[PDB]
Design a protein around this ligand. Structure first.
Ligand SMILES: CS(=O)(=O)c1ccc(-c2cnc(NCc3cccc4c3CCO4)n3cnnc23)cc1
Ligand SMILES: [Ca+2]
Length: 350
C-alpha cells in the first residue's frame, strides 16, 4: 500500500465512520461515504489516486452527531441506499443520488453506535444503541421486527454488532464487557421477519407487534476486561477488540464445539489467536475486514494504520497524526480509506 491522496472536511469535527459501497458493479464508480458532525459525505475514487466529492447530506439538527453509516440497495431496482444514525438515536435513510432523506426511524431511547444491513435481506437493518438494546428493522414495510435486550440482554451501552456470513445470527458487544449471541433463524424470528413483510398500516388499525427477545443464545465476559467496541464474524469464528491493544480471535464453547450446537448455558470460550498492536487504548476505534475477509485493518490513536493478511504491515504518513476511527476497503481491496479525528481522509492504494 502507498498513500496516493489526502483531504480534510471543512467542518473540522472527528470522522467516526467510513464505508465503501460494495453494492456497485465492476466498471461502475467506486464510491465511499464518511460520517462526522451532522453530515454524510459521498466521494468517488478515480484513476491515479483522485478523490472526487459527489455530494454531502447536512442534517437539519446542528447538534446531531452521526457515528455510523451502512449501505444497502432497493431489491426491486438495485439502486443504492444509505442508512445513517448517531447521538440523536434517529435512523435516516438517504437516497445517495440526491443526498435526500427518504425516511427516518425513531425508537431507540438513546444514541445509535452501529448500523448493519442483513447480508442476504437488504431490507433488514440492525441498530445498536446506548439504551442497552439492539433493534431489527424491516425498512421496506417500515416495521420494528424485534428488540434484543432487557433482563439477560446487555447491562450497559451496546457499541457494535455483526451478522454471521448468512445472517442466521448476530453477535453484539458493549460497555458491559460482554459478547452476546442472538439467533434470528429461530422459528419465532423467521415468523416475525415473514409477518413484518405482510404488515401495512393502511390495511389495519392495530400496530405491528415487535418480538421482545429478552435472552441471548450465548454470552461471555471472558474475552476482554474492558468496553468491547468492535465485533465481526470470520466464518463461525469471532474477532473482537477492547482498548487492551489486541484484536482477539475466539469462539463459543470448547475447541470442537459447533456454534449451532452450543446451548445458551455454555460457560466455555476458546481463544484461537491475537492481533497485537500499539497506541489504540482509547474507546471507539474500529477494525475492518475487506469484502473477502482476506485482510484485517485497524487504525491507531496517532495515525498509524495496521494491516494484517488473514491467509503485519504499518501504513504511516508524517501528516497523519490524529486517531484513525474507522477504515474501509473497496470491494476489490485495491483501495483502503482511513478517517480521522481532525476531519481528514487518507487514501492508500495497493
Ligand atoms: C473527539 S472526542 O470528543 O474525544 C470523542 C471521541 C469519540 C466519540 C464517539 C465515537 N463513536 C461513537 N459511537 C460509534 C462507534 C462505536 C464503537 C466503535 C467506534 C465507533 C466510531 C469509531 O469506532 N460514540 C458514541 N458516543 N461517543 C462516541 C465522541 C467524541
Ligand atoms: Ca451452521
Amino acid at each position: 500500500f502507498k498513500c496516493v491522496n489526502s483531504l480534510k472536511e471543512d467542518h473540522n469535527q472527528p470522522l467516526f465512520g467510513v464505508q465503501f459501497n460494495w453494492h456497485s458493479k465492476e466498471g461502475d464508480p467506486l464510491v465511499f461515504a464518511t460520517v462526522g458532525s451532522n453530515r454524510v459525505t459521498l466521494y468517488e475514487c478515480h484513476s491515479q489516486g483522485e478523490i472526487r466529492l459527489l455530494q454531502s447530506y447536512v442534517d437539519a439538527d446542528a447538534d446531531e452527531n452521526f457515528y455510523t453509516c451502512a449501505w444497502t440497495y432497493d431489491s426491486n431496482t438495485s439502486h443504492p441506499l444509505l442508512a445513517v444514525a448517531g447521538s440523536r438515536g434517529i435512523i435516516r435513510i438517504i437516497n445517495p443520488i440526491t443526498m435526500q432523506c427518504i425516511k427516518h426511524y425513531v425508537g431507540h431511547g438513546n444514541a445509535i453506535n452501529e448500523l448493519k444491513f442483513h447480508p442476504r435481506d437488504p431490507n433488514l437493518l440492525l441498530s445498536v444503541s446506548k439504551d442497552h438494546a439492539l433493534r431489527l428493522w424491516n425498512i421496506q414495510t417500515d416495521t420494528l421486527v424485534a428488540i434484543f435486550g432487557g433482563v439477560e440482554g446487555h447491562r450497559d451501552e451496546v457499541l457494535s454488532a455483526d451478522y454471521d456470513l448468512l445472517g442466521e445470527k448476530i453477535m453484539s458487544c458493549g460497555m458491559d464487557h460482554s459478547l452476546k449471541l442472538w439467533r434470528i433463524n429461530s422459528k419465532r424470528m423467521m415468523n416475525a421477519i415473514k409477518e413484518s413483510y405482510d404488515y401495512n398500516p393502511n390495511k389495519t388499525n392495530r400496530p405491528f407487534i415487535s418480538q421482545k427477545i429478552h435472552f441471548p443464545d450465548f454470552s461471555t465476559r471472558d474475552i476482554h476486561r474492558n468496553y468491547v467496541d468492535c465485533v465481526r464474524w470470520l466464518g463461525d469464528l469471532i474477532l473482537s477488540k477492547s482498548c487492551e491493544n489486541a484484536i482477539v480471535c475466539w469462539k463459543p464453547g470448547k475447541m470442537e464445539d459447533d456454534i449451532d450446537k452450543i446451548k445458551p448455558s455454555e460457560s466455555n470460550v476458546t481463544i484461537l489467536g491475537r492481533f497485537d498492536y500499539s497506541q489504540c487504548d482509547i474507546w471507539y476505534m474500529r477494525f475492518s475486514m475487506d469484502f473477502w475477509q482476506k485482510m484485517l485493518a485497524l487504525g491507531n490513536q496517532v495515525g498509524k494504520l495496521y494491516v494484517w493478511d488473514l491467509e503485519c504491515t504499518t501504513l504511516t504518513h508524517h501528516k497523519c497524526g490524529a486517531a484513525i476511527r474507522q477504515t474501509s476497503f473497496s470491494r476489490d481491496s485495491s483501495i483502503l480509506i482511513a478517517v480521522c479525528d481532525d476531519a481528514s481522509i487518507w487514501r492508500w492504494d495497493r
